[PDB]
Amino acid sequence: AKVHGSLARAGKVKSQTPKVEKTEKPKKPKGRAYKRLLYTRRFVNVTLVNGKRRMNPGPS
Amino acid sequence: GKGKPRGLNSARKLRVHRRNNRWAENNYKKRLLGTAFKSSPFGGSSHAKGIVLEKLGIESKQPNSAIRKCVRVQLIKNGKKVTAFVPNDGCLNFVDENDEVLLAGFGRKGKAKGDIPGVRFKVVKVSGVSLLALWKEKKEKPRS
Amino acid sequence: PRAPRTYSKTYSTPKRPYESSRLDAELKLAGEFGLKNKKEIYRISFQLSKIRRAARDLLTRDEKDPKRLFEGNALIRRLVRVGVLSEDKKKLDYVLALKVEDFLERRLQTQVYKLGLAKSVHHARVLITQRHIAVGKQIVNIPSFMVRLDSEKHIDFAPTSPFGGARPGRVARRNAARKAEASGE
Amino acid sequence: ARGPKKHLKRLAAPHHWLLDKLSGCYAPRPSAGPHKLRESLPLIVFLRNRLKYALNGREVKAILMQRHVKVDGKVRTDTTYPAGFMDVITLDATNENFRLVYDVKGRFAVHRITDEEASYKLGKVKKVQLGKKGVPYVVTHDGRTIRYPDPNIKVNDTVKIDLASGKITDFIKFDAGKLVYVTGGRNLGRIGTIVHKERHDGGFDLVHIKDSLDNTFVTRLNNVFVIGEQGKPYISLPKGKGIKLSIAEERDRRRAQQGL
Amino acid sequence: SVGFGLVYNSVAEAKKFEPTYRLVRYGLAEKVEKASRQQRKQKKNRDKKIFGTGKRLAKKVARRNAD
RNA sequence: GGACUUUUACUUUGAAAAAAUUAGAGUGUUCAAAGCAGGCGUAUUGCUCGAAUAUAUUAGCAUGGAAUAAUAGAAUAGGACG
RNA sequence: AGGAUAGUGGCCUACCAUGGUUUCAACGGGUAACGGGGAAUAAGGGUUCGAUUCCGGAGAGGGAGCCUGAGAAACGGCUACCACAUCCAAGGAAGGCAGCAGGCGCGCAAAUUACCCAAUCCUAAUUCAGGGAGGUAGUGACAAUAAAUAACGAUACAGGGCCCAUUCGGGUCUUGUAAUUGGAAUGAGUACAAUGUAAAUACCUUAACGAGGAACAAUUGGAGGGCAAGUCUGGUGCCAGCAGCCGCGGUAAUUCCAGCUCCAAUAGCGUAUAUUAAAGUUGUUGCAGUUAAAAAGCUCGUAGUUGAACUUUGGGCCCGGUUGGCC
Ligand SMILES: [Mg+2]
Ligand SMILES: [Mg+2]
Ligand SMILES: [Mg+2]
Ligand SMILES: [Mg+2]
Ligand SMILES: [Mg+2]
Ligand SMILES: [Mg+2]
Ligand SMILES: [Mg+2]
Ligand SMILES: [Mg+2]
Ligand SMILES: [Mg+2]
Ligand SMILES: [Mg+2]
Ligand SMILES: [Mg+2]
Ligand SMILES: [Mg+2]
Ligand SMILES: [Mg+2]
Ligand SMILES: [Mg+2]
Ligand SMILES: [Mg+2]
Ligand SMILES: [Mg+2]
Ligand SMILES: [Mg+2]
Ligand SMILES: [Mg+2]
Ligand SMILES: [Mg+2]
Ligand SMILES: [Mg+2]
Ligand SMILES: [Mg+2]
Ligand SMILES: [Mg+2]
Ligand SMILES: [Mg+2]
Ligand SMILES: [Mg+2]
Ligand SMILES: [Mg+2]
Ligand SMILES: [Mg+2]
């Protein structure tokens, strides 16, 4: 039941993670327009229906 | 008659039997004993404040293997010593010693979380500043 | 010390947060009706819950019960007045069968779209929010207005709207000013 | 505690005053006077809320201080004066006369009477007793002490008071078949004739009353006020005559006379 | 727009029954010059400490300080 | 007013159970939460609808019922009828 | 029996009697108890809460006592003591925010030393004076209501078409993509004014300004399962960390640290603690007790609970309210 483990490595992985900045991109619509986008994306633009539907495909 | 009395005039027996047997329940026993106010680090409250006495490296329970980076805190309103986990990558650097910290339970109503042995509180704020705000760089600790 | 003001919550949230069936059906309602939230669906489902509960205990009461007659007729009258319940099927058994789509059909946003006048539900909403529709002689900028079956023939463009008259609109005015500036007098 | 209360919080006033929930922490607390607090109608409530002659209490006081209003033939400049059942309210301006009679919803109605009706009121005999010097007297429901009553007058009877002189003109006994007016309880405002009166010695005599359409109800004797013989009241009844329509038929006539 | 209107049978009764604030609204009165509510209350509480007219107190205070 | 009173549980109806609140009737607060308003003319000298209703448990009160479950009665007749 | 009281009463006194309550829970102890109207949740039954807008009660640092008064055992009345505490020239003198605002302290935890009597009402000798009662505004993501952050064209490729579009045109029909391209629309904001108001602030209304990245840029959590959403890419290599729980991490990590993409709710979304449902895991409805936890070793037995059947049934007559049923 030791309580005096090493504390030197705290924050290691985070501090050594290669910093990359977010890529600026066009803003999404907010509110009723975004629900409109979701509706066309899932029910009108429906092209890939793997299983029943697919929502975040990986590259393949 | 499968046990219990069924007479129209057996209300006293049934209510007393229920009173006797509600002591077998954890929540009813704790509430009626007032154990949160009496025997609990937080005196029944949701959060508490304390002073960091020392930084601890707690070795996590098997099969995990890690140093969990808790702090010993002395509560302002009680003087009781507790161990509080400091949640995030880093964030032990933000805590330091002799700093005031706002502690919370973790969600298991007592009952130490996960692989962290004997630790039932987590640091939420340090020096009046959210650990989340410090970890995400939204804000800074007041040095003076 | 004063009489407390009364207030109520107008929605409830569903039981299971993540049901693919409910999520799909809600998004289909939002897309078909141009809604902003799932709360807009929840508010209707909440209204059905109160209506269905009231109709339910009334139907528990036997026929010719004075309370069942009085309240059941008032509930039937209101739902027929708003158009959710058809002019026929004027019964408590039929108010029990009402759907969310029935109520969403009577929103001003839907009625502005279905009476020409908007060419879209999303167009209908922005026109409504932008004070272009008067239900009678009264501008109504709430898309959830519940047209009550006597106002349908009175829904039109606001008289103080550039689609109603008397002003050609702020942006049109600035652009016409620029053209006058470039051209002359 | 420690003494009499001077305030009446809104939401603690009598409901039949029909005061709005909001727009005020308080209600007019009726002054001490002829009628009990819960059974009264303060002059400010009558002039402002019911007759709309005044927009606020300041205007009610302005009206009263010029000595326009009078209750039973006296000016009553008091704003919270506790006018009650069968009180006569005269406005010399507008030449208007009112008698405070409950409508069939248990609320004081704006009921107009003529000058000849306003010349008198009716009082229910609360007690009959010998005073000092052995002089008999009756006490009415509005606190009037009337000396030398007719010996035939008993308790629960009704007297006609001249209201110019505090004198009894005639009286009505309390017997089966006589028209009565319900002045309390859940049947307040109903009018009918006594079918019979059951005693219950030691407490709470009850009265069986049926109205025009043969609807019977039972009320405690304390709420029963004799107002005439079979038909033909001694007072001008308000609209409705205490029939107590049901809500269904109430609604039927709403939709009848609202659509012409 | 919807409001409320009062028409009096003459100006004098208008000035008798109308509130002061409405008469000041119409220029029919003048907004009386009075001190702040706190100033009036503080002056009243200061004058509670004097018994009588107080000019005897002022005379004695002057004479005691002078001699 | 009685040579006049077996007691009780239970259930029915009535009443009572402040207002707010709860349910609920009406009413386009622009909708809604709300609020108790308001509506209609001939706006030329005012006419008119409302501010309901239900529930509110036990105890007490009045009332109908007399199944259910207790209780009491004439046996040393000290019985009833008269 | 007397005394006292406004009055009943061991309320008190004198004398007298030996009573009074209690396993139907007296007496005592605890309460992170003021009581109720009510509140949350809930199929029904229930469970938890109610310091707090109304009603009743109690108190004004803690006790006690009393004056005036119709009414107070009053505290923005007094007297004394106890605790705390202010001024002082040391002689003395003055105190009571559980009123409003405000300060300290305590803490996870709660706002302005503002304006006004215009309204609601209340008091007074009183229409007039006064009222931190009350109202107004300020702070305020407690809770609640509604509901912006875009809409619509033209140009790009889809394709579902008909005379076997032959191989595509036809005045097909544009739902989706072209960080293009076009003119429209509006309030967030800002203000003439009016309205509002006791005076103002704001709202409602409104002249003139007010979107192109319409930067006038929505967030909070998540993406193995529960549980909606990636086996994409870089990092780390049982470390750092994550993880309510099962589990991830030891060199291909869908679970950590990030970027991209996606999902959920959305002006809100997480976290802790409590409580309700889920819990038929408290059970009356409605649990279980051979072996999973639980039939006393056995019998007697009081209080409790429960307790076989039987006493006017049957038939007949009359009144007599309701649905329609036939002009
Ligand atoms: Mg048992
Ligand atoms: Mg008081
Ligand atoms: Mg509404
Ligand atoms: Mg005595
Ligand atoms: Mg306490
Ligand atoms: Mg309580
Ligand atoms: Mg309480
Ligand atoms: Mg407390
Ligand atoms: Mg007191
Ligand atoms: Mg204190
Ligand atoms: Mg005192
Ligand atoms: Mg004080
Ligand atoms: Mg006081
Ligand atoms: Mg204070
Ligand atoms: Mg707070
Ligand atoms: Mg005032
Ligand atoms: Mg206050
Ligand atoms: Mg924005
Ligand atoms: Mg990730
Ligand atoms: Mg999934
Ligand atoms: Mg259940
Ligand atoms: Mg079990
Ligand atoms: Mg076992
Ligand atoms: Mg044995
Ligand atoms: Mg055994
Ligand atoms: Mg039996």
For chain C, the structural domain boundaries read 17-185
Q: What is the distance between the alpha carbons of residues D156 and D137, in angstroms, rounded to a whole number?
A: 14
User: Which nucleotide lies nearest residue D23, CA to C1'?
Assistant: G120
DSSP letter string, A18-35: PP-PPPP-PPPP-THHHH
Breaks in chain D, named by the residue before each, with C–N above 2.5 Å? none
Among E1, C124, D223, CA closest to A36:
C124
User: Cβ(B66)–Cβ(B116) under 8 Å?
Assistant: no
**Contact call for C70 and D251, based on CB within 8 A:** yes
Contacts of A44 in chain C (CB under 8 A): 31
Other Cβ atoms less than 10 A from the Cβ of D229: the count is 14
Measured torsion, CA atoms of residues D30, D35, D40, D45, in degrees rounded to the nearest 10: -50
Structure tokens at B52: 């960091």
Phi, psi for residue D109 in degrees, rounded to 5: -105, 150
Give distance CA B21 / C1' G293 (Å). Answer: 14
CA quadruple C56, C61, C62, C66: dihedral sign = negative
Sheet containing strand D191-198, edge to edge, reads D216-220, D206-210, D191-198, D179-182, D224-228
Report how many domains make up chain D. 3
Other Cβ atoms less than 10 A from the Cβ of C120: the count is 14
**Contact call for A43 and C36, based on CB within 8 A:** no
Q: Which nucleotides of F are covered by protein (CB under 7 A)?
A: 1, 14-28, 30-37, 49-54, 61-63
Do D50 and D157 lie in one domain? The reply is no
Amino acid identity of residue D144, one-letter, is: R
Q: What is the distance between the alpha carbons of residues D179 and D209, in angstroms, rounded to a whole number?
A: 9
Residues in chain A: 60
DSSP letter string, chain B: --SS---TT-HHHHHHHHHHHGGGSHHHHHHHHTHHHHSSSSSS-SEEEEEEEEEEBPBPPTT---B--EEEEEETTT--EEEEE--SSS-STTT-SS-EEEEE--SSSSS--TT-TT--EEEEEETTEEHHHHHTTSS-----
User: Cβ(D41)–Cβ(D84) under 8 Å?
Assistant: yes
Q: What is the distance between the alpha carbons of residues A15 and D213, in angstroms, rounded to a whole number?
A: 92
Q: Does residue D134 lie within any of the structural domains? A: yes
Chain A, window 2-41: residues with a beta carbon less than 8 angstroms from a chain C beta carbon: 31-33, 35-36, 38-40
Cα B20 to ligand 7 centre (Å): 29
Measured in whole angstroms, the distance separating CA C116 from the mean position of its chain's CA atoms is 17
Nearest residue on chain D to C69, alpha-carbon basis: D248
Whether omega for the bond prior to residue B63 falls within 30 degrees of 0, making it cis, is: yes
- For this PDB entry, the determination method is cryo-EM
Among A11, A7, A8, A2, CA closest to B118:
A2
Other Cβ atoms less than 10 A from the Cβ of B63: the count is 6
Q: What is the distance between the alpha carbons of residues D62 and D54, in angstroms, rounded to a whole number?
A: 9
Distance from CA of C114 to the nearest CA of A (A): 18
CATH number of the domain within which D185 lies: 2.30.30.30
Among D189, D179, D172, D195, CA closest to D223:
D189
What Å distances lie between residue D175 and C153, D149, D227, D229, CA to CA?
A: 63, 19, 12, 10
Structure tokens at C159: 């008289």
Q: What is the distance between the alpha carbons of residues D178 and D158, in angstroms, rounded to a whole number?
A: 11
Among D89, D52, D59, CA closest to E13:
D59
Cα D1 to ligand 11 centre (Å): 14
Q: What is the distance between the alpha carbons of residues D12 and D17, in angstroms, rounded to a whole number?
A: 11
Measured in whole angstroms, the distance separating CA C172 from the mean position of its chain's CA atoms is 31
Domain ranges of chain A: 1-60
Q: Is C31 on the interface with A (CB under 8 A)?
A: yes
Among D229, D255, D227, CA closest to D242:
D227
Q: Which nucleotides of G are covered by protein (CB under 7 A)?
A: 24, 31-32, 48-49, 53-58, 70-75, 106-109, 114-123, 127-128, 130-135, 143-153, 175-177, 179, 183-187, 195-199, 205-210, 213-215, 217-218, 221, 223, 227-232, 234-236, 238-250, 253, 256-267, 271-276, 281-285, 287-289, 295, 304-307, 323
Buried b (16+ CB within 10 A) or exposed e, E39-65: eeeeeeeeeeeeeeeeeeeeeeeeeee
Do D139 and D156 lie in one domain? The reply is yes
D231: left (phi over 0), alpha (psi -120 to 50) or beta: left
Other Cβ atoms less than 10 A from the Cβ of D127: the count is 11
Q: What is the distance between the alpha carbons of residues C55 and B66, in angstroms, rounded to a whole number?
A: 61
- Touch between chain C and chain A: 3 or more Cβ pairs under 8 Å: yes
Other Cβ atoms less than 10 A from the Cβ of D227: the count is 22
Q: What SS3 state is found at D58?
A: helix
**Structure-token match 């229910």, residue found:** D124
Give distance CA D200 / C1' F69 (Å). Answer: 30
Chain B, window 78-107: residues with a beta carbon less than 8 angstroms from a chain A beta carbon: 83, 89-93
Full residue range of the structural domain in which residue B34 is found: 1-144
Q: What is the distance between the alpha carbons of residues B112 and B58, in angstroms, rounded to a whole number?
A: 13
User: Cβ(D228)–Cβ(D178) under 8 Å?
Assistant: yes
Nearest residue on chain C to D246, alpha-carbon basis: C66
Amino acid identity of residue D85, one-letter, is: F
User: Cβ(D200)–Cβ(D178) under 8 Å?
Assistant: no
**Structure-token match 């808790």, residue found:** B70
User: Which nucleotide lies nearest residue E41, CA to C1'?
Assistant: G130
Full residue range of the structural domain in which residue D140 is found: 121-171
Q: What is the distance between the alpha carbons of residues D99 and D181, in angstroms, rounded to a whole number?
A: 14
Sequence-distant (≥ 6) Cβ neighbours of residue E58 within 8 angstroms: none
Amino acid identity of residue B2, one-letter, is: K
Do D126 and D93 lie in one domain? The reply is no
Amino acid identity of residue D57, one-letter, is: G
User: Which nucleotide lies nearest residue B112, CA to C1'?
Assistant: G244
CA quadruple D172, D175, D180, D185: dihedral sign = positive
User: Cβ(B122)–Cβ(B86) under 8 Å?
Assistant: yes
CATH number of the domain within which D164 lies: 2.40.50.740
Give distance CA D103 / C1' G25 (Å). Answer: 56
User: Cβ(D179)–Cβ(D136) under 8 Å?
Assistant: no
Structure tokens at D61: 């006081």
**Contact call for A13 and B117, based on CB within 8 A:** no
- Classify strands B81-85 and B121-126 as parallel, antiparallel or unpaired: parallel
Structure tokens at D249: 């038929």
Measured torsion, CA atoms of residues E7, E8, E11, E16, in degrees rounded to the nearest 10: -120
User: Cβ(B99)–Cβ(B143) under 8 Å?
Assistant: no
- For residue D216, the surrounding DSSP H or E stretch is strand D216-220
Could you tell me the resolution of this structure in angstroms? 2.2
Cα D79 to ligand 12 centre (Å): 33
Do D95 and D206 lie in one domain? The reply is no
Give distance CA D210 / C1' G315 (Å). Answer: 40
**Contact call for B58 and A14, based on CB within 8 A:** no
Among D155, D184, D200, CA closest to D84:
D184
Structure tokens at A59: 């590259």
Amino acid identity of residue B111, one-letter, is: K
User: Cβ(D208)–Cβ(D182) under 8 Å?
Assistant: no
Report how many domains make up chain B. 1
DSSP assignment letter at A59: P
Last residue of a domain, one of D70, D88, D116: D116
